[PDB]
Amino acid sequence: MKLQTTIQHEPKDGSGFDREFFEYRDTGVNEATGGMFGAHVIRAIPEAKPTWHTHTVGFQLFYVLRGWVEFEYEDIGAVMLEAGGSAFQPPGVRHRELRHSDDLEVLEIVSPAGFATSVVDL
Amino acid sequence: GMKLQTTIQHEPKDGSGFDRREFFEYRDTGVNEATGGMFGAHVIRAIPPTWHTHTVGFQLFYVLRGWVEFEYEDIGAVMLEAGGSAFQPPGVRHRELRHSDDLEVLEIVSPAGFATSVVDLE
Amino acid sequence: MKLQTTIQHEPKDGSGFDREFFEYRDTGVNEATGGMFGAHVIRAIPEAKPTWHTHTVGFQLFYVLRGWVEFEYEDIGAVMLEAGGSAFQPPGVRHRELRHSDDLEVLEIVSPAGFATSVVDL
Amino acid sequence: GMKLQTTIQHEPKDGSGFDRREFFEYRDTGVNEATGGMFGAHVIRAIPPTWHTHTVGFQLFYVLRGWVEFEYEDIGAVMLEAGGSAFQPPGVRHRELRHSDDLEVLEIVSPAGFATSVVDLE
Ligand code: NI
Ligand code: NI
Ligand code: NI
Ligand code: NI
């Protein structure tokens, strides 16, 4: 297989509509679902040091609320997300974070809540 | 049998809380096409109340702008502003009471192609 | 998109290893998960009448425990499953059941438990 | 916070109940490759006990042949025979105590690529 890393950006004109390092604010989804899912807002603590890794996740989505963050993926390469940007990360995709703004705030929705993380041995 | 509980969180103001259909339009994150319909995620914006259920496993709303008031069978009326989130258990009976003209809300749901049923009140 | 209907058959030689109409026996998964998932064994009540349809499901898998059943899918066509056979059905795939043995027993694992079913209007 | 409960069912004998790693080998249903790793499902057979957890959302076992005894932090030791099922909550602490030489069990799990951790007993 592999699902594809899938990125969307918010068009700046209002179009697109049809009819140690971080701290976390919990939505309560983990407790509500017994850890089947988690959802939390991640904020940067106000560069440093990109590391290829993977997560033992089924579902994983990020939506940028404030600031900017640059990710890199084994399939699609480097992508810069600003507020309104979203990144769907396939199960276990090899990726890294390249850099982020000091005001970054991003919502993460994941399954399971309690995923493991492994550094890619290159 | 047993049911999960509708789970609401609000963003403190403050900045604490961190631990170290036809009247709407939709912007797709691409998660439906990325996952073959297992999941969907989209931003919903208002364009300037009927009890119902959805055939969903997972369903979460995160308010990006404005405000929206929902009502739930289990927990009653809930007013959400930016930063507020509502986890809606599978098939929970609920309705939307009112919203702001500037409402923007992210919805994450499994599956993408859920059905909606009006609740038989009688 | 679309994920692909995925069938496996149990090799008859022990290989493959590496190192109204129906009644239902519940595993308890629906109650345990608040309807996020369901799992139950379906048995035939001891022909009749194939109807193209879809289900509002994320995940859906069948594993045949006894007897045989012939399904048909919009993507892969007709497939006959015997004991040990499995069918992964993509979210909302158009399919039908063509015929089954009178002793059919099949395990279904689904998300959500409470999916809707729609007849395909042809 | 809150946790789902390990949920066991047994097949009545009778026929009622219907309502109208290195010591094992594995046969893949194809669900991992079909779903890009969101889910996996495989049949496990014995080849003729350490507390641990898995980083899984969904996890279900259905015994096809033989018997297997598990032990759970929440509900204790459980003996399963053919037709028995065990739903294992996300990350539940558990272990396998013993099994029959002819054990065959279907496992359905999300994600396919979960990690396993030995429980720190001290
Ligand atoms: Ni990561
Ligand atoms: Ni609704
Ligand atoms: Ni069907
Ligand atoms: Ni285990």
Q: For chain D, which domains are there?
A: 1-122 (2.60.120.10)
Are D36 and B38 contacting, i.e. CB atoms less than 8 angstroms apart? no
Cis bond upstream, residue C46 (ω within 30): no
Are C62 and C89 contacting, i.e. CB atoms less than 8 angstroms apart? yes
Cα gap C3→C43, rounded to integer Å: 27
The Cα of D117 is separated from the nearest Cα of chain A by a number of Å equal to 10
The pair of structure tokens assigned to B121 is 């009140």
C27, D106: Cβ pair inside 8 Å? Answer: no
Best interface-test mutation with D: which of A56, A94, A118 has the largest number of D CBs within 10 A?
A56
Terminal Cα distance for chain B, rounded: 22
Helix (H) or strand (E) holding B33: helix B31-34
* A95 Cα distance to chain centroid: 10
Are B104 and B43 contacting, i.e. CB atoms less than 8 angstroms apart? yes
Question: For residue D22, what is the nearest residue in chain C, using CA coordinates?
Answer: C19
Are A58 and A116 contacting, i.e. CB atoms less than 8 angstroms apart? no
For A81, how many CA atoms within 13 A lie in the half-sphere containing its CB?
Answer: 28
Q: Which residue in the block uniquely carries the two structure tokens 């993926």?
A: A73
Chain B residues with CB under 8 Å of A9 CB are: none
Q: Give which of B77, B82, B87 is closest to B104, Cα–Cα.
A: B82
Compute φ and ψ for A29, nearest 5 degrees.
-65, -40
Question: For residue A2, what is the nearest residue in chain C, using CA coordinates?
Answer: C3
Three-state secondary structure call for residue D66: coil
Best interface-test mutation with B: which of A2, A10, A17 has the largest number of B CBs within 10 A?
A17
A56 at interface of B, judged by CB pairs closer than 8 A: no
Best interface-test mutation with B: which of C33, C60, C111 has the largest number of B CBs within 10 A?
C111
Cα gap D78→D88, rounded to integer Å: 12
C32 at interface of B, judged by CB pairs closer than 8 A: yes
C90, B36: Cβ pair inside 8 Å? Answer: yes
* D85 Cα distance to chain centroid: 8
φ/ψ bin of B76: left (φ > 0), alpha (ψ from -120 to 50), beta (otherwise): left
User: In Å, how far are B30, C56, D41 from D111, measured between CA atoms?
Assistant: 20, 21, 10
DSSP structure class, residue C67: S
Subunits in contact with chain A (3 or more CB pairs closer than 8 Å):
B, C, D
